[PDB]
Symmetry: D2
């Protein structure tokens, strides 16, 4: 459907984000479009602008949400807007990102070209994490990048067992474990030794965090696999579970973390000019044409 | 169909392979089954046994081929028996392998349990490699593990461009490139930093061989992607292409190597006792149950 | 000097440590030697034994200290006994370690052979870490393995600058930094990608902890270099500094951590049967003789 | 001693090397200095210039040798000019290198500042490699970067044993082994996973080339250690030994390669403006000042 009510999500960061968020406000209101603003960012804006709503509310209000900032800002908007299946459009901070595509100086050219009816709809799946004490459920969180098990208030290594589709893989002693989507394969998992996974791929990568065992290597499994991490019951370690490094749960010795694909996919919007391997060449420095 | 004519493929290695190849000959002839032998191995056998045939011929003769040895012996049989779609059963040398499953001491117990009608049919796809000079074709080879570009008669680094589905990825200076299936993900690609890919996964992993660029990391793409490696035309390097490290082509500056999935899949046979993650725990040393 | 007053240091762990600590008590008292016990371990012992002292006190009382347990138990004793320059002898838990050498079943044979006058004296140097706010000093700690900067109560990456001998190296965004001795090169630094450093080597290795930059590789510098880590002043991150993962300081944005070699070396005692590369072959699984 | 007879060493590469080699010829003859040219490069020069000599002869003729090109050009000149202990000065191709320091546009400014008496003398040690069949010696070669054992005319893995100071380390199956100086630690060894070693460090790094064993990690040993690589006698593999990837020997099953530090050090000349960590920040992309 054509985009009428357009929401805006931003991050309270350097001044340039507040600059582009008003060029976007100007360019969109110029086209006689209703602009609804996030309440968590409208408390510090030029005259606070127009109507104000919350992030869970912005799903059913808006037909499109433009996120200004970087890849990190895209993670928070995705977890809330994927449930409503709202198209999401990302703006850079001048540097090309794996989730943000529009440069602040090409704002009017690329955003207008999307509103005029030339764009690509790409869907990225999220992860569903849930902690359980025997049968009782502690908490359930979503993740677009990764679900990361890591030590909680103790530098000591943690111990756990990995299960994929109820099948025992191994027990391991390490700092933790990174479970990443293709979207998150370029983030923490890449810094921990994991591979790059193309966004077309229906797969999940499991990356050990500095394992005490040198032969512990990343595994890539079917994206429809169900992961089950069992914290060591015979150890006094209380690890932490992080979803996109922003939502944190504290696990008890013996707690079980289940990770699987979320049914609701995030509807990413790109210009037709989008090229995934060009993002890799700029974000990682790969050589260009010979 | 029930297995009647059963072929045998072996490797001219240590004495134990010649030992198990005759226990298999005894156990199979005991069950009143026709045993056909590979000609390349029957030239040195106890009285040369029964009928003798070639590997390309063994496809339409036999209903099942038992390969004794290790994972390396499985690679040669797969490239010839996947075209005929002949079931293949592997025997260990005492140590569990990613392709061979039967231990020489459990030969009669596991092979009989397969012939009695309790087995798993698992299909593994191969790679199709073809070198081209402009339009003319040099050679075309198959690979169950990997297609590897590596330096040819020169320790100097090679230069090349990578294309996936006609889309330019990057140019790179390295020793070479490893393109591996899920089967080959545990071989050379694992030693070069690549991840483990579950056999259920329809994916191909591209691993750079000691790249001059430190940010060159492995990529995992859709298994239906078509890869196109273009040797640097402006360099006096003549690289070599290896298929399972056994079939070698010499590439010219500017030659293009195309790699894609082969339509014919190898029909692997396993006992019901087969567990993939148990192979990883023994081949790599991962910790067992807590 | 010949060893008369012999102290014992242990860890409150599995039952076998309490078993060997009494075979050592029997074997030493059998030889008419004064056995002094650590107070932190004598509170739970068979009748509490003989005299009891503290770890800082055990330096001037004893001529030799036998540490039962593993490599982790050796770290705590080293930081306190290196100031007094007391010889230290380590006992295994059945498995050969990089710091502990005696197997519990060869206790009487190897410990007696050392007391009879056949042993090797090997000295290992420690690290000296000190945090400073401008000029004021927060805390100063020693380390036999490593001084590790890591995130403090925030999964977000930390930012810092590295200085070696007052010379600027680089600024970096990562989980943290591992500064290890040759003793600690096989511990956390090895799991983070660092190299093995022979104990004869006067060198320090600096290993980045999952850096956001892929080209951030470990550096090995002169063991007499002075390291200076400056926490990012323009970031709201409060990192933590760990010495052997046991002593923890919380750093403020802008705090400077100085790391250099400690003058006092730890006097390690080994039997003449000691072989460093045999420890590597067992701890890491390297292949034995062809 | 003040530099009078100044030799020039270049590489037959792109046109710019032939350009700078004549600005250097102009600037030096302008200062009334005798310029002697390498015969292997004077066959294609503007009128062939002045006197012509060989590389082994250029040691006793010249007081200083200026090498134009890159790090690779510095390797060949070092092996021949380190025996004569002739100071060596390197010129860049516009990009800063680990061995070349002068940019072609700062040629007259930096080279003149060295001739005027403001420079640093830094000495880098080389490696001494010698192959032996039992007692007979095949060949002996020097290396400024690395001595590399790698497969010879066979993609199959090679097998060998490592000995350090006559002490057995391990047996290993891999593509090969990289033995690098601090100078070569940033070259092949860095691409194979090795660490950066500061030039002040008296150490040698041993890096396995894609080992079949995942726990085979680089080792850093004393620079005065004597290495002894024994090719597997029970294998039909004929590996090759490369010194700076330019001098090649073919080893037989059972041949022993001995590697140790060469007594003659290469006298490198740098301007006072030289900074080693600035080279790392540009060659590897590390972050600059915060
Ligand atoms: N050592 C590490 O590498 C490390 C440690 C902790 C967390 N992380 C990652 O950080 C994520 C959360 O980021 P945050 O905003 O909360 O702040 P953060 O933990 O400080 O991480 C911010 C950094 O992550 C990058 N990033 C985030 N998602 C990415 C993706 N899909 N591909 C590539 N780079 C990506 C950001 O790129 P922009 O600059 O464009 O935003 C930025 O450089 C986690 O999900 C985790 O994957 C990495
Ligand atoms: N440095 C390296 O790691 C390296 C170098 C060259 C080639 N290779 C691999 O060797 C393969 C060809 O082997 P080859 O028989 O001709 O002799 P080879 O090159 O000497 O390699 C033999 C080794 O490869 C192992 N191997 C083969 N396929 C494997 C798989 N799918 N998963 C795990 N391990 C596997 C074999 O296991 P078994 O002992 O059970 O046979 C054996 O240890 C190539 O396709 C390539 O992947 C690896
Ligand atoms: N992910 C990791 O690899 C990781 C994470 C945190 C800390 N660490 C290391 O743990 C050390 C402190 O150990 P802890 O007793 O307090 O418990 P810990 O953090 O849980 O680490 C205990 C483990 O470290 C091993 N270890 C300790 N020093 C070693 C050395 N020099 N060489 C090889 N292995 C060594 C121990 O061997 P034993 O079983 O023989 O004791 C044991 O396996 C730190 O200094 C740090 O280097 C490693
Ligand atoms: N895959 C690899 O990384 C690989 C493979 C084979 C050989 N090598 C290295 O190449 C060396 C021989 O080089 P070559 O001239 O004969 O041509 P080459 O094998 O094609 O290697 C040339 C490349 O090596 C770089 N290099 C050479 N010495 C270096 C050093 N000390 N630190 C950093 N980079 C260095 C060169 O830098 P410049 O552009 O400034 O010359 C150039 O990028 C060998 O000694 C070996 O270390 C590396």
């Amino acid at each position: 459907e054509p985009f009428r009510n357009i929401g805006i999500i931003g991050r309270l960061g350097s001044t340039q984000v507040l600059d582009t968020i008003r060029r976007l406000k100007k360019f969109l209101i110029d086209r006689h479009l209703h602009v609804i603003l996030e309440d968590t960012i409208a408390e510090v804006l030029p005259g606070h602008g127009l109507q104000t709503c919350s992030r869970k509310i912005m799903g059913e209000i808006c037909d499109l949400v433009v996120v200004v900032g970087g890849d990190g800002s895209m993670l928070g908007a995705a977890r809330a807007l994927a449930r409503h299946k709202v198209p999401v459009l990302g703006i850079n901070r001048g540097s090309l990102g794996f989730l943000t595509d529009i440069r602040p100086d090409e704002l009017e050219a690329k955003v207008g070209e999307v509103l005029d009816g030339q764009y690509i709809v790409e869907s990225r799946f999220l992860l569903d994490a849930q902690v359980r004490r025997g049968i009782d459920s502690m908490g359930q969180g979503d993740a677009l990048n990764d679900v990361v098990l890591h030590p909680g208030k103790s530098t000591r290594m943690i111990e756990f067992e990995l299960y994929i589709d109820g099948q025992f893989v191994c027990s391991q002693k390490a700092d933790g474990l990174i479970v990443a989507t293709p979207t998150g394969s370029t983030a923490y998992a890449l810094s921990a030794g994991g591979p790059i996974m193309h966004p077309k791929l229906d797969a999940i990568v499991i990356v050990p965090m500095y394992p005490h065992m040198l032969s512990s290597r990343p595994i890539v499994v079917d994206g429809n696999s169900e992961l089950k991490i069992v914290v060591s019951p015979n150890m006094q370690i209380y690890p932490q579970v992080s979803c996109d490094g922003q939502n944190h749960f504290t696990c008890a010795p013996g707690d079980t973390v289940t990770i699987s694909k979320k049914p609701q996919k995030l509807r990413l919007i790109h210009p037709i000019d989008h090229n995934y391997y060009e993002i890799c060449r700029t974000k990682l420095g790969w050589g260009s044409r010979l």
